[PDB]
Design a protein around this ligand. Structure first.
Ligand SMILES: Cc1cc2c(cc1C)N(C[C@H](O)[C@H](O)[C@H](O)COP(=O)(O)O)c1[nH]c(=O)[nH]c(=O)c1N2
Ligand SMILES: Cc1cc2c(cc1C)N(C[C@H](O)[C@H](O)[C@H](O)COP(=O)(O)O)c1[nH]c(=O)[nH]c(=O)c1N2
Ligand SMILES: Cc1cc2c(cc1C)N(C[C@H](O)[C@H](O)[C@H](O)COP(=O)(O)O)c1[nH]c(=O)[nH]c(=O)c1N2
Ligand SMILES: Cc1cc2c(cc1C)N(C[C@H](O)[C@H](O)[C@H](O)COP(=O)(O)O)c1[nH]c(=O)[nH]c(=O)c1N2
Ligand SMILES: Cc1cc2c(cc1C)N(C[C@H](O)[C@H](O)[C@H](O)COP(=O)(O)O)c1[nH]c(=O)[nH]c(=O)c1N2
Lengths: 363, 363, 363, 363, 363
């Protein structure tokens, strides 16, 4: 509590950037109550598959950090709790540990304290245009004995950074498609707060990507975070960032767009998942699991007991929503009755998402 | 800073008239975020055609002023900055310069400091019913070696002015049609804050006019400006003007209406364009270029450095929206995916704009 | 200013009952602006027919009062101004003057100071329920040399009266149909603030009534007026009236319902008409004439000059809406382009108003 | 209603400058209610002396305008109503009419329609600073057969003028003392919205001035008026004027300061007098007469009838305050019981106004 | 605009810490307006003495920064503008430059571009408790050829720092008294936002300090700044700092306390001076000169022209206050009439500041 944290963690944890001027559109999704659930709360089974492993609840912690000692302390807390609950955990970008051996332990610690759960490696898509490839993926994976690797897209954050220029030439996907052949674990492509559209999902699927993490708008606003970095430097790009605070595909729309355009994908619904009711909605809408990042960071900073109480609350809320929809298991929740209203309805109509066909696909 | 400005400039620059009680409907248009853009920021090309010239960015400054020394100094600042950025500039109505030789310099200064960019001349449609014709158009054009001439429509402003009566007999378009035959440059017909409908666009097109500048409601509210002139005179028309503050076709609806009804038009989207994101929206919706007047005037009054900063910000915001839609160039932006929601969707439905065919036409 | 007025006039003029918790739905109707109107302001012709007479402007003052000296003074003001402007005027219910000779002059004064315009007699439907018949109708007409007689429906007001029991049995319409055979002037059936539905209009038309005045919700709220009378008496019906403050067909929807269900009707659009723009919207939507009551009462109380200024304002606003839709005359305004949005659109869709056929019917 | 008014009249009448960010402190003065007044309403006598004449009510209209035709029309309205009510009227500064013969009639009209009441000429102190002398003072008096001449102080307004440099050297008071020797009528020195302090009153009294008009803060805010002129010119002095909007001695404190420091003065209490109750408070606090300017201007603009209703209201409110303090005449109101509270009390204590002796002085 | 600033400068310039939950009490001080000033604006003389030099205006820029290249750039701007306006400038703490030769140039540059005005060096009282002695003071003075050195007190900022333990033992004052013997320039002791009380002023004067800078609460809130640094680190001291946001002696009360307790002091009135009227109030209350820091930093960050404009406004506001109190020079302003009200009057009463004697002392 004396030394400063890296600036992006300092801002995410302590500034007003969660859902700032943005929306998941989850308020436009209603799960229909069943006054006769047909199940017992104690029979509800929240187990599900995550590649070759079984996990205890259809939630994951998505990648955030690593690379300095204090960041390894936060990673260790999150991993210990994730191991206890049987939930998968992604790490943050491993680029610093690829570059510097001293940064490695703040990632490897995760696997030491969480030997059984799925652990998910992380590198950013622009690194593929800047020299990273098969070897650096394998290094990231072996560092934490990962069961998958996430490749993140963050062009909106990069456009509004004080220095910088997003680079997403098609060569990156050509290289990723090559790497996907040689890796021993699956690739998931995720956004970083601005969501995945049907066009992007279909382009990724054409290069062999089958696993996606929506990371839609409505949760951590990385455009807001770069706006605050720009404010702190007296950088005029801050006022430009302000005009883009509601840029991106809202999480509920991105889950519908990826499930509809890639019906057989393995889909993580994330970006603004803050309760187990949000998690249930994301699954019923079409995700296979719900992901969360910021609220886990905030609770882990408060400490291990805070984070265990956080997962207790999320799991309770998910099971309440399953009980009150008569969903005895995760498969039943994916098929349960919903109502779609409001702006989400209008988004799907304009985008050509024929709801009857949608309903069949999501199940 | 001692002498009063002309009354309409004083009010537009310093009273609350920008979007007063009115709306562009641009908030109902969303550009769909592409988390894999397929391009590098440094590859984005914003060049586009403006008649026989290329311009650097698909934006123009539309006509505002001229005719007095202090107005000449604002024109000179705006023209030097436009020249430096490679953007077209319209001047304000040249009627006073046609009438008085001493008023000419405050228009001509534009072409002196901006020898390369397109410069657009300006006369009012009602002058055509009051003796102006071919010679006065040629004179307006020669005064600034213009590349085009804008003919403005402002009946709403004229209805509420303390004095006066709009005159828009069809003879004006008969005369404009004859003129267009003899002129060496194209004619653009523009509104002045209340927008172009399908009926107006089709009537103009039927007299040979193919170049339109929407100047929709949502930006400078000229009904509110005359309301303020009437308030200042103790004139009761002020309360009637109040009842019409939201009169007009909103800029986004007018861009759709003109593009749908006149698919081969060259279309400036203006009226309440206040960021490069608004500009990108207007182009994606169907415009060829985005036009701005009031914010350029306010920054030019602050000075040359303020207006250079203003254009740097608009350009950066337009490039951010192109980067985040995967639009490598202006042609790509015109075909990028959008969502239309809300009142703009209801407007297009009632007006018979078949969205399937809309999407095809805008591209 | 020393003696109290009759209670319903005192409440209407001075309590907050105009539009209380109620809506005309006119905000959902947009008149499409035409930047090239095709006319000059001075050629606009506002003349129209009202039965066998021509009137100067398509607006009428609907019935409000009469029956005491002070009410006769307000009637004289309204009538002299109406005569000067060439606009028709209805009087308030003539029941008291049928009952008492001393109450006659406060009605007859209207024809004395207004010899040329149309003057519309008034009796309530509940008087036909109670045995008024042909002679009392003839006497109401003769008293003011009326050009028509309006029969008002006010069941909502009657239900919430401290004393009240409305009776609206079908034999009253049998009596009215018999009476219509023997009168020299046409009958108009109007509501009193809660609007005419398609069922009510079709029922009235089946008994021979062809002239209707909507008197929809959104203007004077007569449920609110009786709520206030109940409050002043410590009567618990006030809380019940509160629950009905938004009861009734909104003016814009009643115009649509009557014009669609009775396409040949002569239709006054009234209830909450408060500007010339509201008047123009009522006519473009399907009315022949716009009617107003409360704002005329409030201005007449202020005095003759205040009421002349009031009409000047309404007329100017109507002509501005005509000018800015390119409507050279009232017939053109009836066919001008509009947009219907919002709740009005949903109301019409649910009620089976096929908008295509609506547009044809209204013109 | 078509030509613009002179700028300071346009701003005063129609912008929000009455009491802007300023206070009369009259809310800190309570007149003690007397439940047994000892008089009947009809015996109240409001007559008082104004120099050699008797006036009907202890109120005057203070100087505002003149010098153009339209300003002459407002002066004629005020003067005819003042003559009808028996109240004195001052004219606005006569500088323009001293400079230009064509501007004379807009002042002289006052004496033509008001032959009997006191009429007070007006010139500014800055004219004495600039070499106006005895003949220009005599000419200002003769122009309207004035009964007195007011010399106004307006340094605060002059400091914030776009153009301004106030000069208030002691030789002007030497000139004024010389002039006073040779005039046939008395001089009143008044402020212009920022109030007379004890230092200023004692300095003026040392040069022979015995008649003062407080013109304190809380009413028309002339710093605010010049702030608005600076805003309209894009002049940065506007922000400085903003910081001074509450500069000056509040009217109630200026009445106390002048009556205490100059106990034999003839004292007009003005600045923010807006009701007959404010007028009665000013007199009970120590003024001889209450003066008003802005509300008279606003009512005269409305018309003769509006200004007659205005005076009827002020007079009735004054007589109600006289009745309810048991004050049968103006002398009694001057001695009636009051309470001083709040900031006014603290102001007086800090300024060394021994309230015991204050009560004796005021009476 | 790309690299981060040092954290205290980032927070002060761009977070909401000016006057946060604190008050100068300057709103309780009124300068009495003089409607006959007795002077001309052009004759007002703002020159005054600052030790052995004459300065152009009685305002100084107090110490803020230096020690890194970007901090040297801001110092260069402030010193160039200060030299232009003839106003003294203090630098920020020189500790880093005593420690590291590379940090010297970012202070020295001040004397290079400002060869004439008074420059004031700066070290903290905590360096005397640690270890600094005569040579390090001499070195700070020679580094910039200073005309005086300020020694700052900042115990409240130190208490709330994430790492802090303030130490203010009396041997530091013994050391300062010994150093003062051997310096060739005077020492000023200043606070840093929490004000100087009569106890602290008397204690300092007993060790030979004769020059003081109040730096009261109401301006830059350094407990707020440390509160935000604590929030950024997740440090629970932030909630404790919250409870102390309004800790300290308000600037106006600190000026009265130090002038009353040390009547012969040379006194800078600072902490929340934001306009020339604030500056005038501080001088009239008892200060010799008014000091500012934060608004100078914010303008310097915008650029040299912004800073020049900021000083033009301050000087104009000061001269307006001088003009409107009839104060021909600074000595006159120091004796001009005031009113003290409200909490400031209560504070002085409770603290035994006999206002009679106060008046005499301040003059
Ligand atoms: C502090 C912190 C840091 C990072 C992130 C987030 C946070 C809060 N996120 C993005 C994260 O995985 C997730 O996609 C978004 O934050 C949206 O989910 P939430 O709204 O936060 O639940 C992230 N994403 C990733 O792929 N690589 C990483 O290095 C990081 N770093
Ligand atoms: C002060 C000023 C003056 C003018 C205008 C505007 C302003 C702000 N505009 C209309 C302008 O070109 C534009 O169509 C509208 O103002 C809408 O765009 P903005 O919302 O202002 O960006 C205008 N247009 C025109 O064709 N001739 C002209 O003389 C003027 N004068
Ligand atoms: C004071 C007053 C008195 C009456 C009325 C109204 C008012 C305000 N109205 C109803 C009126 O004609 C009209 O239908 C409604 O008031 C709705 O129009 P406005 O919203 O008032 O313009 C009414 N109508 C009627 O047919 N006979 C009448 O006696 C009266 N009395
Ligand atoms: C429109 C207008 C114009 C003038 C003024 C006022 C107004 C409103 N006032 C000042 C006026 O006499 C009076 O002292 C102040 O306005 C304060 O009183 P009110 O608050 O306005 O009642 C003013 N006074 C003066 O002595 N000579 C003048 O020429 C004018 N001009
Ligand atoms: C960014 C910045 C940094 C510094 C300061 C201020 C600011 C704004 N201040 C305190 C400054 O001199 C002054 O006493 C207080 O800020 C109060 O005055 P203002 O309210 O800021 O005008 C300060 N004082 C000091 O003696 N040595 C220093 O190093 C600094 N550093």
């Amino acid at each position: 509590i004396v030394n400063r944290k890296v600036e992006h963690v300092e801002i995410a944890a302590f500034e007003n950037v969660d859902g700032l001027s943005s929306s998941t559109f989850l308020n436009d999704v209603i799960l229909v109550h069943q006054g006769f659930p047909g199940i017992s709360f104690s029979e509800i089974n929240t187990k599900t598959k995550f590649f070759r492993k079984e996990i205890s609840v259809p939630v994951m912690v998505t990648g955030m950090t690593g690379g300095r000692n204090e960041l390894g302390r936060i990673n260790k807390i999150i991993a210990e709790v994730a191991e206890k609950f049987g939930i998968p955990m992604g790490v943050g970008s491993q680029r610093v540990a690829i570059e510097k051996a001293e940064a490695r332990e703040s990632f490897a610690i995760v696997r030491k304290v969480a030997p059984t759960i799925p652990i998910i490696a992380n590198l950013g898509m622009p690194q593929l245009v800047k020299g990273y490839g098969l070897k650096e993926f394998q290094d990231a994976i072996q560092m934490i004995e990962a069961d998958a690797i996430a490749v993140h897209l963050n062009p909106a954050q990069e456009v509004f950074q004080p220095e910088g220029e997003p680079e997403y030439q098609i060569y990156a996907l050509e290289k990723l498609r090559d790497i996907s052949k040689e890796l021993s674990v699956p690739i998931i492509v995720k956004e970083s707060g601005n969501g995945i559209s049907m066009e992007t999902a279909k382009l990724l699927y054409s290069y062999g990507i089958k696993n996606f993490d929506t990371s839609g708008q409505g949760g951590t606003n990385w455009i807001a975070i770069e706006m605050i970095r720009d404010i702190r430097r007296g950088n005029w790009k801050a006022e430009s960032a302000k005009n883009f605070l509601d840029w991106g595909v809202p999480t509920a729309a991105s889950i519908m767009e990826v499930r509809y355009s890639v019906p057989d994908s393995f889909l993580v619904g994330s970006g603004g998942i803050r309760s187990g009711l949000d998690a249930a909605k994301a699954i019923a809408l079409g995700a296979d699991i719900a992901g969360m990042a910021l609220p886990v960071l905030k609770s882990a900073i408060e400490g291990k007991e805070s984070l265990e109480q956080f997962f207790r609350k999320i799991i309770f809320e998910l099971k309440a929503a399953m009980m009150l929809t008569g969903s005895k298991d995760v498969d039943a929740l994916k098929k349960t009755s919903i109502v779609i209203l409001g702006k989400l309805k209008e988004w799907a109509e304009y985008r050509g998402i024929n709801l009857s066909i949608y309903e069949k696909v999501r199940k």
